Amino acid sequence: QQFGRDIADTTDAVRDPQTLEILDITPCSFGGVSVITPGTNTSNQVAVLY
């Protein structure tokens, strides 16, 4: 075996081409961001939520 595929059919665990050591693949921060703010007539303060 060289590399495996998850349920999404993507490379999630690949070994080195020569070394027997195996490294898992986990994506880093890629999620969405939302902004919570009141109406513009009241104020302009905003909140950052992930």
């Binding site: 993507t10 994506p27 969405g32």
Partner: peptide
């Protein structure tokens, strides 16, 4: 939670994500 609600809870088992309910 009542034991009935416990029984009902125990009897139920890449871009897309699941937002938790309010």
């Amino acid at each position: 939670r009542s034991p009935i609600e416990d029984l009902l809870f125990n009897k139920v088992t890449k871009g897309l994500t699941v937002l938790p309910p309010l």
